[PDB]
Amino acid sequence: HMPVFEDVTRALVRELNPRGDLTPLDSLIDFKHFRPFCLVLRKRKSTLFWGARYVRTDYTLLDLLEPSDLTDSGNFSFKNMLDVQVQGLVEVPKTVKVKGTAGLSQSSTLEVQTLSVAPSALENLKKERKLSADHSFLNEMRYHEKNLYVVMEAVEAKQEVTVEQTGNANAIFSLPSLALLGLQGSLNNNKAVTIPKGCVLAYRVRLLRVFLFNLWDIPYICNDSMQTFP
Amino acid sequence: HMPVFEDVTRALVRELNPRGDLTPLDSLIDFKHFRPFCLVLRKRKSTLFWGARYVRTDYTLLDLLEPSDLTDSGNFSFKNMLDVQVQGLVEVPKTVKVKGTAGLSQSSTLEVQTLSVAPSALENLKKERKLSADHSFLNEMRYHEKNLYVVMEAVEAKQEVTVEQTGNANAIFSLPSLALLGLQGSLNNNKAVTIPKGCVLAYRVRLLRVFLFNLWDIPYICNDSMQTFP
Amino acid sequence: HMPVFEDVTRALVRELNPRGDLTPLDSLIDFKHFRPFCLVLRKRKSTLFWGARYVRTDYTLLDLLEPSDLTDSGNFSFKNMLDVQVQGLVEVPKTVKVKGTAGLSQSSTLEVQTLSVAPSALENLKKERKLSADHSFLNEMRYHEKNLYVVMEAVEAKQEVTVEQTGNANAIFSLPSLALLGLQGSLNNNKAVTIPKGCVLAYRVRLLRVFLFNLWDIPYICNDSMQTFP
Amino acid sequence: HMPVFEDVTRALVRELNPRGDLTPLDSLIDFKHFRPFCLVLRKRKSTLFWGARYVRTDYTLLDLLEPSDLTDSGNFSFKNMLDVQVQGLVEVPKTVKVKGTAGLSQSSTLEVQTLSVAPSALENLKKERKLSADHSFLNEMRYHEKNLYVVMEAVEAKQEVTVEQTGNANAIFSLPSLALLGLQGSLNNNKAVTIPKGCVLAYRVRLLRVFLFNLWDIPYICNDSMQTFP
């Protein structure tokens, strides 16, 4: 449970845009829902020591209305590889000796490409378009006060890639408390994913503040107290 | 009893969409019933330490009504392989010495492809179509308060694959309680499955809330208290 | 008496659909009666630690009435092989030393294919068709309250295969209770079956609840108390 | 977390314009927003021991108005490379022995090119052009008193380059406080980025002081007390 895709997205984030917005993508499949314009749920938001996250939602903004100008191609070539080994001991007085040696090789030379909805295109959308009010999905959203958020920019693989991630572990117990249980668990896993083209790797988020009656906006000030359905 | 197909589905899940929805497929044969639109029974639902599961049911939603737009092809190539060995001892005072050494190699370089019923297609279905009320199957379902669920998205093998899974075990007892029973059980199994194309590997679930008289929906809020037949 | 065909069916079951329905086939010959639509007798039904079983019956449902749409081909390739060796000792005070070493190699790389009567086809059958009442067979069945069951889906060998299963045993006694009976029984058997095409391997069951006068059904709720002839 | 792009920008800055203006670029992607004419937010401004920083903002000055004369090509070829190794010990009285050995190789032979908005072109812009007052973005900016700043000159890669940065670490603990925890964490990462053409590396900033009603300027005196929206 040091999964592949999440670790890759986290690594490329810390390489690419530390300090903030870009949140990696936890579920690999749902990229087609983490496209731009799309919606997301708070889902254990950030800390100073954690990384905020969100989840899928099967309705985007165009569908939930009653302007396709995706504008950027900032491209990059991230080649990460590492081999982390760890070895810990514990020698307590019952002769209880624990000793765990793990290791983990990761390898990925992938491409990245960026997208963004034009602020002009958006502002014009919110300007002319208008929100519905009988839409069942959002009807329940306002019912239950989700404070859902929205993704502005994505981070995609401009071409199909693969990731490799292998691990090993070897942990022994030696405890003459229960008949000298001398045990040695172990494993040596490998993993090889073929990240398909278009799979968003890291995405950005942006609040969706819908006014009473009944239009909406997506301000820059996403203050902690901000809320979608007042 | 470390079966092959279930372990594969579990591994690909933790590789692909941890944290939630995707539940592996326990029975291999019933994929043709775990297709999208299909129904499922609670069957020892989730915990914080377990993985929710469900079962077959021989009637889908189209049949149980009185719109085929399966929309996604997010594809992936999962190559897992590992060799876990375990060795435990027990040396208690009757000279009772137990010692078990097991091992397990698993290997699978398979393909995966994803499906999803379009929310638009669905909403339009639930809109125009309407539920029957004399259907015998559902008649008993409402009789007995099953709280059945529904599968939205599937996870299929875009082409035929095979899985290999072998194991070994060697467990000795040495107990001078019954005439020094010194025993050594052992085994070395192998297994090779040919996963046929189209066999759903992991699937997703979604509640089916049918209102009194007599239409229905499948909300996003699948709250614990939610129920199919009120 | 670790027969071949039953062990194979049991192994493929635990590989294919654990946890429930699929019951292996004990008698090899009677597959032509364990076809779909067919009937079966309770015959030491399940436990939490056993595997339910049934038996032949020389009349199916079509014959016992006054719609051939067998619909599935979910196919599989099960390759099992193992070599289990066991060795036990007993050294009790009369110098009675028992010591048994057995072993067992099994090998089978077979194909499997699945069948199922369409729920629609069935429901229409039960709808239009109707049960007889002078049929002698069922006359005795209602006489004697058999609570017979019915098979919906089968599991067949899409082509002819063979199974190999050999065993060995070597058990010695050394008891100076009767003139120092020092004995050593032993054996080394082999077995090779040629499973013919179409031989159902595992089958599924389904109750047959016939109402008073005089039609019938086969509900999903097969509750323990359920009964064929009230 | 000794990221690549930031370290490169910092190194080239200290090589190129120490002592002041040029602030490196923290996020790699947002160069298309750190182009000239663009806006930025204070975001933990400078110290005597730190390096001021800023962030993206999705609206430039041309858009926020109701003159393209980018004038410079001062070009350079920075080839940096180094291998810093560090090794520290701690030997305190509980037998607690900590010992950490890290290392870091960085390599980059890149090109640099400079840009600047002509002071004449600017002065004429601010002269004829005039600020809007209903623009939503800036409406919130004046609401919340951001004291946003503006970028005059950029520092770009006149052609596509790559950067390489690898690291290693090996830190051991030896503490007979908890059962003689003798541990050894370690790692050996590598990283290879393909900096695309046009990616601003270091940029310069410049305040934006908008007068009451309702025009603006960007003075040379950027005094600490200066403020965008009085």
Curated annotation (Swiss-Prot), chains A, B, C, D:
Changing R142A: Impaired ability to induce pyroptosis. The chain crosses the membrane at residues 75-92, 96-117, 161-177, 181-195. Residues 2-230 are annotated as: Triggers pyroptosis. Homooligomer; homooligomeric ring-shaped pore complex containing 18-36 subunits when inserted in the membrane. Forms a ring-shaped pore complex containing 27-28 subunits that inserts into the membrane. The pore conduit is predominantly negatively charged, facilitating the release of mature interleukin-1 (IL1B and IL18). In contrast interleukin-1 precursors are not released, due to the presence of an acidic region that is proteolytically removed by CASP1 during maturation. Changing L181D: Markedly decreased induction of pyroptosis and defects in liposome-binding. No spontaneous pyroptosis-inducing activity. This is Gasdermin-A3, N-terminal. A cardiolipin binds at R10, A11, L12, V13, R14. Pore-forming protein that causes membrane permeabilization and pyroptosis. Released upon cleavage by some bacterial effector protein, and binds to membrane inner leaflet lipids. Homooligomerizes within the membrane and forms pores of 10-15 nanometers (nm) of inner diameter, allowing the release of mature interleukin-1 (IL1B and IL18) and triggering pyroptosis. It is a multi-pass membrane protein. Disulfide bonds: none annotated. The chain holds residues 1 to 233 of 464 of the full protein. It is found in: Cell membrane; Mitochondrion membrane.
